Symmetry: D2
Subunit: 267 residues, 4 copies
């Protein structure tokens, strides 16, 4: 078991197609003992996580709530038992209001909306690190989820800016985590058909946005030398588990591309 005996906190489950759901599943298959955090609809999240291979304690965490962050370490310790620390943390959280992502023109996003998205999608990575590093073991691992923002693209708009910020945050979190013997890295995944993503392809954010995602999905599988299957999150979940294991011991402040190789190819 790749993660045997490791204690790992996984945020970001909201449905059974959430990337963090599959991260949580693969980690439990590999012997990890999990603690879960969920935002807002905790009864729904509980019913979703009941389908994980093993039962895992669920804690409430709204990343914009200072009280939630201040109590987090104590509530984690209460779930895993005093004297036990975390070996791994998974940040799988993201949000941008509709004004900053979609067919709404890039210039029309109010900063209040953009700021909320950068708060939840980028700053929260440092927030969670700060809350959880004091209860992490040496040799631990923090992993966040990324979507390659080094080039601009239709519709993603302000969320691409939030991703650019998150990659920069990750390189500073790595400097802090290094003082604990802890690594911090991001996994840049290719497009995955989550519920939200499926809703956008169906036009939830405007028809242009939906058409552009479909073109991006299609271009992705074409470019990827090993193909890309947007309906299979297993590859991304296994990559996260790789970074949570002891088998990338010299990688930190970095980005692993679980994208089928698409970013290495022009056409």
């Amino acid at each position: 078991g790749l993660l045997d005996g490791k204690r790992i906190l996984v945020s970001g489950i909201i449905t059974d197609s959430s990337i963090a759901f599959h991260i949580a599943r693969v980690a439990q298959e590999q012997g990890a003992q999990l603690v879960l955090t969920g935002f807002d609809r905790l009864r729904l999240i509980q019913r979703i996580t009941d389908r994980l291979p093993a039962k895992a304690p669920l804690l409430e965490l709204d990343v914009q709530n200072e009280e939630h962050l201040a109590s987090l370490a104590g509530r984690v310790t209460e779930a895993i038992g005093a004297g036990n620390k975390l070996d791994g943390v998974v940040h799988s959280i993201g949000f941008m209001p509709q004004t900053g992502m979609g067919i709404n023109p890039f210039f029309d996003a109010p900063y209040a909306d953009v700021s909320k998205g950068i708060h939840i999608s980028a700053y929260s990575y440092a927030s969670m690190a700060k809350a959880l590093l004091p209860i992490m073991n040496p040799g631990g691992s923090i992993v966040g989820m990324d979507f390659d923002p080094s080039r601009a693209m239709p519709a993603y708009n302000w969320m691409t800016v939030a991703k650019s910020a998150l990659e920069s945050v990750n390189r500073f979190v790595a400097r802090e985590a290094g003082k604990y013997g802890v690594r911090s890295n991001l996994v840049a995944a290719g497009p995955i058909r989550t519920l939200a993503m499926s809703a956008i392809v169906g036009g939830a954010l405007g028809e242009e946005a939906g058409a552009q995602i479909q073109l991006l999905e299609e271009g992705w599988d074409q470019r990827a030398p090993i193909g890309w299957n947007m309906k299979d999150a297993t590859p991304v979940a296994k990559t996260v588990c790789a970074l949570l294991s002891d088998w990338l011991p010299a990688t930190t402040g970095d980005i692993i591309y679980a994208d089928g190789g698409a970013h290495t190819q022009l056409l």
Copy 2:
């Protein structure tokens, strides 16, 4: 004259060592007709700009003030005359509260402070573009100031995150500006001894911060194959003028490194 007959808006002058002061000077030496914008201390800014080679109208612009942005194009047109448009825009604006930049630990920056800095240093680039593109000529140029944030560094902290966001914003501003025949690019400069920078070297942001900047300055000149003189902003001002001219007509969404070549060298 490299910029003869061009009408160009320059923001960001606060003292005579501001990078935008030298941008403004070099552009006037090259035949440009300028309109200036200043924030807060407008009487001070006016007295500073009285020393530019030619007189230039000064307009008030706080980039966080929605009314200032809504009136900007009209006030620009009133200064340059109806029927005249802008050929160039210079964004030379930046700010991060002391909690996000310096010896204060990276985790201790409140998001309210970080958000203010990302607002003024990154989002304002899109804000100004939105305000000014409707009064820009085809073949125009928007230029912002950048400090290479692709690797983390001591003390810069949250401001590095703001720079990462600004580079991403620039690639989307380029998509909008392209509809106008307008380019958008950033100039990534090496360290320059502005008043603020000199204050930090003297310890305004804590002694550790001051020592780290000095080490970064020293490493910069060493790495740069043509040297780097932190007391000479002329090189950065000439680079901005290059991008405002017609001599980089196929460069947009991009970053020009006016850093002595330091970013191309390891040691």
Copy 3:
């Protein structure tokens, strides 16, 4: 005149659609005095260059010929007059045998062929620098031509590898040239319809290769926020002249993208 009084050596003219032909034309329009070098078909090259706005001495240079390189500086000094030095050098040279570029499978290129292409397309940039730096003025400029090789693409094959090598060579040439007060940079251009390029679109290197270039050309104009016109080399020639001028004085070991911004955009 952007280049008034500057003495500049331009290699790489073979027909009137060569990128170096337009570089040479724009530089002469901007007051530069040129010395030309040509390979192999010198009578043809002479007849082509007779159409430049001004007459320019033509020197023979095969970059694989050690005797040609050993005599180059002396022959340049004889053309521009003793006591005069060069202010600028343009490397616009490239070649890969058909086995390393096209529909021939990537694995089937013999190393002898690949090595010849890397010799002429990458190593020759250091070769020319070595020959010409001792007769270059402080404040001089060396410019090479590049095609963005940071991602793989169909058909370009071994020539992409040669471009990757040339970018690396450029960063070391900059270290040598810095000792002379001389900059060294590359211009990464978008696809241009040279004779060779047109021949490939017509199938000279196999039908698959021809179809892939056409798709790459089409994707380029789409991605470029300001468009890309593959039949107009003026934009690339003006960019080279920008780097030969005094208006990028702090850029070296670097790459300027004269590609319409296409490399900054995903779709």
Copy 4:
């Protein structure tokens, strides 16, 4: 066992401090069955590999020898048994003559020497892929060793150019290997005290070269958020094994940085 039942070819062992020796050791500890290839001093290599945890067949391979490459697959099949294929290939080979690496000036490397180094260090990655892909299983993995060449550095000189070429080769090998269901990636390691490296620190390539490596080693550990121990190759060996396993299933044409995070940090 991370690599249980996997059959893996490992090149590049020459002493017990070779990176490939530790790759071979860690892979055998993780249940892999190995086939080894060695160059030139095969009796020495055999005596070195006698100390691996398990015995492994040794095959002769000079990567510049066309007959060696033409027979390789057949000799591999004879060692692992007909009907068995390879699951993994490790390229751990590199060489640059003293004229292209060290205190000898960058311009003084003859192309014959540079070409030999690019042949053995870069082209050989495609050569081995071509020889071995027809005897690789779907889901297989090819891994090469890299040293981050994206910025220039003292002394490494032409070998940095060879690394730049190898990264480009890797992105095309990935396109070929994808047709087989096979991944291809590089591991960019921090400096490791091999015999050759120790000899250079002791002055084998000139005193300046030796002093610059020591400064690069020291800067590396400083920059690395988790530290860098140049005398421990275990971290790099475990990273290679990660890529040979099934736990990075969506990564290809890519580069994993096993460098302590040093490349993500400026100072």
